[PDB]
Amino acid sequence: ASKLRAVLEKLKLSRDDISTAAGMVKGVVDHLLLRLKCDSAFRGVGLLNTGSYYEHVKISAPNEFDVMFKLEVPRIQLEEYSNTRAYYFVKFKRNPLSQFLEGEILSASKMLSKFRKIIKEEINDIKDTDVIMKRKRGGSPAVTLLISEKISVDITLALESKSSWPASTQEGLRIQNWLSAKVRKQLRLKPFYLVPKHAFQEETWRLSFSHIEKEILNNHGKSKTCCENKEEKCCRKDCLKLMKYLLEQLKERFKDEEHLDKFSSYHVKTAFFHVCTQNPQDSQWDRKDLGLCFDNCVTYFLQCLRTEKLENYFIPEFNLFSSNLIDKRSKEFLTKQIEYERNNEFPVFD
Numbered sequence: 001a002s003k004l005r006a007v008l009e010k011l012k013l014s015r016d017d018i019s020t021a022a023g024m025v026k027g028v029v030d031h032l033l034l035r036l037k038c039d040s041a042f043r044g045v046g047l048l049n050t051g052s053y054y055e056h057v058k059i060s061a062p063n064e065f066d067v068m069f070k071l072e073v074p075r076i077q078l079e080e081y082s083n084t085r086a087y088y089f090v091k092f093k094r095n096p097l098s099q100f101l102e103g104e105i106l107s108a109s110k111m112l113s114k115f116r117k118i119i120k121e122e123i124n125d126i127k128d129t130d131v132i133m134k135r136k137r138g139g140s141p142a143v144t145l146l147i148s149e150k151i152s153v154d155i156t157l158a159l160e161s162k163s164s165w166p167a168s169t170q171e172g173l174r175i176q177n178w179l180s181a182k183v184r185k186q187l188r189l190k191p192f193y194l195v196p197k198h199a200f201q202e203e204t205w206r207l208s209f210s211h212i213e214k215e216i217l218n219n220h221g222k223s224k225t226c227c228e229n230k231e232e233k234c235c236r237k238d239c240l241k242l243m244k245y246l247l248e249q250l251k252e253r254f255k256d257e258e259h260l261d262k263f264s265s266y267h268v269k270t271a272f273f274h275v276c277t278q279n280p281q282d283s284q285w286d287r288k289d290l291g292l293c294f295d296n297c298v299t300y301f302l303q304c305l306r307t308e309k310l311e312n313y314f315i316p317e318f319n320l321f322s323s324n325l326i327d328k329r330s331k332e333f334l335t336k337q338i339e340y341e342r343n344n345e346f347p348v349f350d
């Protein structure tokens with residue numbers, strides 16, 4: 001459809017002017033890292049080795065950045081919480097970060113408090129940089145920095161574990177018929193991350209594989225040279241852009257009906273990875289079949305909404321569409337709206 005290409009062109013024109021705000025983001029992040037190194041608890045803090053200071057959770061908000069700070073720690077031991085498959089208490093192999101211990105458990109609350117305090121005091125020194133209260137997110141992102149009242153950056157703290165991935169990830173990352181089993185082995189040799197998120201609960205941590213997700217998106221083809229020359233231009237990243245934008249537009253349209261609050265771009269990204277697994281051939285993502293491919297993604301996301309099943313791509317026992325996480329009527333609301341847009345040629349794209 002031409003409307004899809006027009007939407008993509010709008011998104012690219014919106015993206016070209018960032019190369020100036022990205023420098024500001026890099027400066028502020030570098031400053032806060034050099035500050036956090038001075039603390040006795042955060043000596044090994046840094047940015048995820050993702051080749052970018054930042055990511056973008058929202059494609060329709062080029063002003064909202066998302067950075068993640070990793071903290072290399074002594075050998076970590078993990079305990080599962082209530083068979084959640086994703087949430088864990090952290091212990092230390094043996095006796096630095098000792099100040100944040102609450103018994104045998106590493107306190108997420110205490111560490112986040114010191115993190116935020118260090119932020120507040122080091123941002124009072126900067127210029128046009130205000131800290132705001134976004135603790136309604138359940139510890140992650142930890143902070144939400146504000147520059148010139150037009151730049152918003154969410155900062156999430158993450159613990160790096162160079163151990164083997166937890167057992168819940170054993171049947172995840174099913175990229176064997178798509179990106180090969182060698183690549184899956186290589187990726188699972190990389191470390192994993194733990195972010196402070198609660199379940200009621202007040203001291204749990206959740207698994208994070210944003211680096212692996214970024215690696216997959218930027219190396220997404222069966223052919224190693226996908227999207228490296230003009231003869232192999234597939235439309236996977238364009239379909240993902242279309243899915244993110246559809247969700248963002250629907251969430252902005254119905255921001256006053258609290259039925260689309262708990263949906264995020266992580267859901268469409270998870271579904272999209274599953275569709276990639278289902279459609280492993282690059283020929284199934286020809287740049288000429290953009291409409292058909294996007295329609296495959298939309299219909300698969302609808303299937304996940306109706307059946308209330310959206311497995312985490314790395315932890316398949318974690319149902320992101322769990323009745324414990326999102327109510328059935330909210331899923332049904334999103335299903336109706338997506339069916340409406342699909343039956344009416346997506347009026348949100350006009």
Ligand SMILES: O=c1oc2cc(O)c(O)cc2c2cc(O)c(O)cc12
Nearest residue numbers: 057208209210264265266267312320
């Ligand atoms: O790493 C993320 O993991 C998740 C896991 C979940 O189960 C979930 O429901 C949401 C997320 C999620 C949502 C975001 O907006 C984001 O920027 C990152 C993540």
Ligand SMILES: [Zn+2]
Nearest residue numbers: 221226227234
């Ligand atoms: Zn490609």
